[PDB]
Amino acid sequence: ALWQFNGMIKCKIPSSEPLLDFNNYGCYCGLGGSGTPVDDLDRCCQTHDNCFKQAKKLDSCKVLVDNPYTNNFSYSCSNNEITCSSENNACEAFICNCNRNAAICFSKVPYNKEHKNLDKKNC
Ligand SMILES: [Ca+2]
Numbered sequence: 447a448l449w450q451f452n453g454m455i456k457c458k459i460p461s462s463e464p465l466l467d468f469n470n471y472g473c474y475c476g477l478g479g480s481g482t483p484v485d486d487l488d489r490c491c492q493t494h495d496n497c498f499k500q501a502k503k504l505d506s507c508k509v510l511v512d513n514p515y516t517n518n519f520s521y522s523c524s525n526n527e528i529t530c531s532s533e534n535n536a537c538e539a540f541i542c543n544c545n546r547n548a549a550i551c552f553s554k555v556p557y558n559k560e561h562k563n564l565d566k567k568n569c
Contacts, residue, residue, distance in 0.1 A: 447518055451545045457523035458553040468552065472561045473569035481569035484561050490551035497544035506536040517541050 448465075455464040462468075470476045472488030474495055483489040498514035501507055507517060519538035520531040528549060530542035 447515065447541070447545075450519060450521065451548070453523070454521060454528055454545050454549040455552055457528050458526060458549045460526070467557075470563050472564055473566060478566075479569070484564065485558050486555040487552065487557060488561065490548055490555060493551065494544060494548040497547065498541070501537070501540050501544060504537060504540060507540070510537060514541055514544070521546070 452464050455468065456462060468475050468487075468491075472484040472491065473479055473481045474483060474488050474491035476491075479492060479495050483492045501514040501517075507514075510517070517537050519534050519542040521542055522529045522531065528546050530539060530546055534542055
């Protein structure tokens, strides 16, 4: 889920509005994504995109049929750390981990403004 991904990123980077700051960055952060990641933050998004793609192939996800986009989940944020809930079923848990991994990834890499709003055709 997106709206949950948004909260997860804010947990690690509280000075940020994720849907504004990490959208449309490089070749992978945002809609679609193809080509070579332009920097480490773009690589975080590529990994994320790959993780959701993988989620769709998961039987536990198919056998409920709702998507990486619809499969909700629960997580908690305690002084800048995210915990995916043990109550999450296998599908919700996979998606929560994809999101958690990307949030941690975003907080550990440089943000290069020259890559914001890249012409995705040089991707
Ligand atoms: Ca993407």
